[PDB]
Design a protein around this ligand. Structure first.
Ligand SMILES: [Cu+2]
Ligand SMILES: [Cu+2]
Lengths: 620, 620
């Protein structure tokens, strides 16, 4: 069995057993995070040592713990007591979400706030949001959550269409107490509904759509062995799954005639922040670290055939651990299918009289996650020509507020009295590079313009420049669309038939990076968001852009600290961290339900192969 | 019958008849261009005056003519004698392409050049390329073409794999004479074949691909009436076709509940240049104006089912005029079909317990054109959410040269001794805007960053700015990815329910624009390529970025001259000219047959509708 196989229900149970037997999982203990560790770099051993990292939270206030367990040997390898006031709080627990609404329901100053608005508490939903690190000294070391109210006229009503502005409440989820209730003033609560399923808003459903049937009479072209190993059109890879990172890709290799060539050792979305541009004290603290604080994989939806995934679909049902160590299965949490991608190559030659056309195809691996109001779709695509692409589809319900009577520079109006604060959706991709092996380097490519003159000039010439990033301190780069800036990851010790280093080029979308002031709190906690690309020397403990504990933790602990080591990255075991996001100024068309918008990046072969890798594709 | 219907064979014949009867189409006359004129702005008349513009070339050296004909009345409206030395030569004729190879075959200094390379003339193909405007005074007023040689080992051999560097020949196609033969020196002619159909290069064709069947058991959701009027999912438009511009789109409107709302009056790719960055005297003159000089529509391929277009396809067979006025039909020259586009909107709400998912779809209208070595696919997409997108797929065979022994800064090596000069593929989209009517304006939107401070600052706030482009002189804009710059075309006199101007936002890819030195020849002839966006006040005679006669014409005559009028564009009949291209540094993977690369832009509703326009889409 492959050491990259998905964690099974049985292994989860074993971890529960081991932690219990060791006296680490008492009735007052809760599992905040549990996931397999990747095999060590020197995995040249038959030692199928299947390890698990666990974060244990204590419900009675005692110190939490980080624990590494070996399911293979049946023992606990290590256990360290965490000082959350220093390194950050553990990820938020699902069972804590309910608590904020329940506590506030009997808080006297909260009830007074609702009475001043003539709102019935039974109809007030409270969005349990992560608390960053701000000016509240009494929050340090404590497990705090922030709540924002939304009115729900009836059980099936879209509470998001009725935000209760001017009111916030901070809650201590462990000692079960309300530390603060802030009321800046009453704001009319938007009355218009936002129910996209109500036939009065949708009107008569259109009957003009004829069905589109996509089928594969002979099954798919890809094969799945060992539960998660995929083999598709020369592509070879292992589809993993982590509750924090979500779908992870291991050992991406291309079968270049007899020789299986590695390209990327491990690919994943290591982090994703959602900063809000509203300066009002009611939401200025709002910044979700979906991956870091909520754990994307935890909230993965169960995808349905025909609706979420169309065509010949093959599902993967990843196994996750609940708060007590019991295995929980995300049924159909991962969709896999290949799809037609139009024309791959084409040419009608006059001289030779030959007409040549070839269709392209892509392998799709996706999953969807729901975090409160937002829904994200993570898509990984592998193309016949050796291209790799990632794409995020952001949908759901936009986070709302009240639209001030005098208008606003940081909020869009969606309906009468209804507003939506400006925000960004910034992602961080962690590419553990293995271009034909682990001896890689990163080159930054710029288009260079030439002046008309003595040396070859009719004013038509233009070139390209390539500077090698040698040390970590100079591997923090910005995008530059004007000069068509791209980054090439190559292997200096592996050459193509023209005697040039094989490589892969990274094409970024060049969307704006983190817009917040450089001195802001979010700028610190999410410094990775301020630059388009970072390259680091590999290290087993350097897993996330922000660090291991993002919840209520001050920033710096991630990329900015890793980089300070100033290690050599010229032909070494390296890691590429790419920052890409969406600056969203909500428009009327986003209400009441937001249509999909996208972002991403792609990697294309750059002298990797000796000639077109698709000369052998057949003809329909 | 609609005044936007495709030109028929019968109308072409009528134009032939009328020109003949008027003594304008003698045996020595040839039609260089023929196409319907769009109905006048004040088309409030029942006057179905079907007019045609014609460019008549004289084979014996006499002056050419521009002629406007009325097929409805059966008369010639106007005929003017053209001074090609002033306004430019007519587009290249197909029958002229053969002439350059035939003339050179018996030229003594050409034969000497081939003998010095031990090349047999019968195996030497000559690529008939357009001659720009350079330092040759004897070319002015004359119809000249430039030829580059390529060896073809056998009838079905890829001549492109064997360029004959260091040799060029200028030819006068009307007086049938060779004006010059330049030999800068012998270069070894690359011997390796580039035959992508040869089983020795392709190896055994892979058998791993399983079929993907896309069908619509109940037919498509769109309907075609009047030969070219399309009605699909609230979208309404007329698909036109011009030999110069190719597929053109007229009257793009959206049915917003009872009210048919215009968005774009006329959309087309008004021009596309392909400048080469090689400074060598053998190719420094190379710049194809595919649309302007060769007429894209003329070389449209006949698309085949299953290969070029997959699914339930509906074809359009546009009619074109040959050089003698006879109707020529491009069979299956236009593909039209709708296709699934994944998730449109989705949300699993915790509070309401409602799970909502909707699939997106796109209407595809495409055509492919082959010009020598290059093959281009033009795709127009209409999405359910009101989004409009254009996409160009560039494929074919890369233009080759010899790779110098010492290497080069402007040429990539693809094979031993084989090179490919650096180049760009720059397109110009002409959007005749009609956002809810002809009273439109253009606003440039920039993301503005705010400093942490006294006024609302925790350093998290960010805004957006919008400057209105009022006059033509200030409507020449550059892209700015850093600030997320976009352009909004709105109607000041048409507001949405929130009392804000309805609009559409333009999202550009932000790829580098024309790289050539600002003082170069190509910079002048293709000045439109130096800026990302231009807005002009509409005018019946301002049809192309470069002008009506691009062939051997000096530049300026297009956009830079139109703009000098400095007309008011704030709430007027306006035209948006968007520049977008691909900077191509050939890689090993592009040889011998180039896999598809893409570019484009998209327009998304920006407060156009009162709420999400897709609330009425059904559920699978
Ligand atoms: Cu958003
Ligand atoms: Cu190209």
């Amino acid at each position: 069995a492959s050491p990259f196989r998905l964690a099974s229900a049985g292994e989860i149970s074993e971890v529960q057993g081991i932690l219990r037997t060791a006296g680490l999982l008492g009735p007052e203990k809760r599992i905040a995070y549990l996931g397999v560790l990747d095999p060590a770099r020197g995995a040249g051993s038959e030692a199928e040592d299947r390890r698990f990292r666990v974060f244990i939270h204590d419900v009675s206030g005692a110190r939490p713990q980080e624990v590494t367990v070996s399911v293979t040997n049946g023992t606990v390898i290590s256990a360290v007591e965490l000082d959350t006031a220093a390194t950050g709080e553990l990820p938020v627990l699902e069972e804590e979400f309910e608590v904020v609404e329940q506590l506030l329901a009997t808080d006297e100053r909260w009830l007074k706030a609702l009475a001043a608005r003539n709102l019935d508490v039974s109809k007030v939903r409270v969005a349990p949001l992560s608390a960053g690190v701000f000016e509240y000294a009494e929050e340090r070391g404590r497990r705090i959550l922030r709540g924002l109210a939304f009115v729900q006229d009836f059980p099936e009503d879209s509470a998001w269409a009725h935000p209760v502005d001017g009111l916030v409440a901070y809650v201590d989820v462990v000692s079960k107490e309300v530390t603060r209730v802030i009321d800046t003033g009453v704001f009319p609560v938007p009355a218009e509904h936002g129910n996209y399923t109500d036939p009065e808003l949708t009107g008569p459903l259109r009957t003009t759509q004829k069905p589109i049937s996509i089928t594969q009479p002979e099954g798919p072209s890809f094969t799945v062995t060992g539960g998660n190993h995929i083999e598709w059109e020369k592509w070879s890879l292992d589809v993993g799954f982590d509750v924090r990172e979500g779908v992870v890709l291991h050992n991406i290799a291309f079968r270049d005639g007899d020789r299986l060539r590695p390209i990327i050792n491990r690919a994943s979305i290591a982090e994703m922040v959602v900063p809000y541009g509203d300066p009002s004290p009611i939401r200025s603290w709002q910044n979700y670290f979906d991956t870091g604080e909520y754990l994307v994989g935890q909230y993965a939806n169960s995808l349905e055939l025909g609706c979420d995934c169309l065509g010949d679909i093959t599902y993967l049902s990843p196994v996750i651990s609940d708060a007590f160590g019991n295995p929980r299965e995300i049924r159909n949490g991962i969709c896999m299918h290949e799809e037609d991608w139009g024309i791959l190559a084409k040419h009608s030659d006059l001289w030779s009289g030959i007409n040549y056309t070839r269709r392209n195809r892509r392998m799709v691996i996706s999953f969807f996650t729901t975090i409160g109001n937002y829904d994200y779709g993570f898509y990984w695509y592998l193309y016949l020509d050796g291209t790799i692409e990632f794409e995020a589809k952001a949908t759901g319900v936009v986070f709302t507020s009240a639209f001030p009577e005098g208008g606003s520079d940081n909020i869009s109006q969606l309906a009468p009295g209804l507003g939506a604060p400006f925000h960004q959706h910034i992602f961080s991709a962690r590419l553990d590079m293995a271009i034909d092996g682990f001896t890689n380097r990163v080159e930054e490519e710029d288009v260079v313009r030439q002046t008309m003159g003595p040396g070859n000039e009719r004013g038509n010439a233009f070139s390209r420049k390539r500077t090698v990033l040698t040390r970590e301190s100079e591997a923090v780069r910005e995008a530059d669309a004007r000069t068509g800036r791209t980054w090439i990851i190559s292997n200096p010790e592996s050459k193509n038939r023209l005697n040039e280093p094989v490589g892969y080029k990274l094409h970024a979308h060049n969307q704006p990076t983190l817009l917040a002031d450089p001195g802001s709190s979010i700028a610190r906690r999410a410094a990775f968001a301020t630059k388009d690309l970072w390259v680091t020397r590999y290290a087993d403990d350097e897993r996330y852009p922000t660090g291991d504990f993002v919840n209520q933790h001050s920033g710096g602990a991630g990329l900015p600290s890793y980089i300070a080591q100033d290690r050599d990255i010229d032909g070494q075991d390296i890691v590429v961290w790419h920052t890409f996001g969406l600056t969203h100024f909500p428009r009327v068309e986003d209400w009441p339900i937001m249509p999909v918008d996208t972002v991403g990046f792609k990697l294309r072969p750059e002298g990797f192969f000796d000639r077109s890798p698709v000369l052998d594709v057949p003809a329909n």
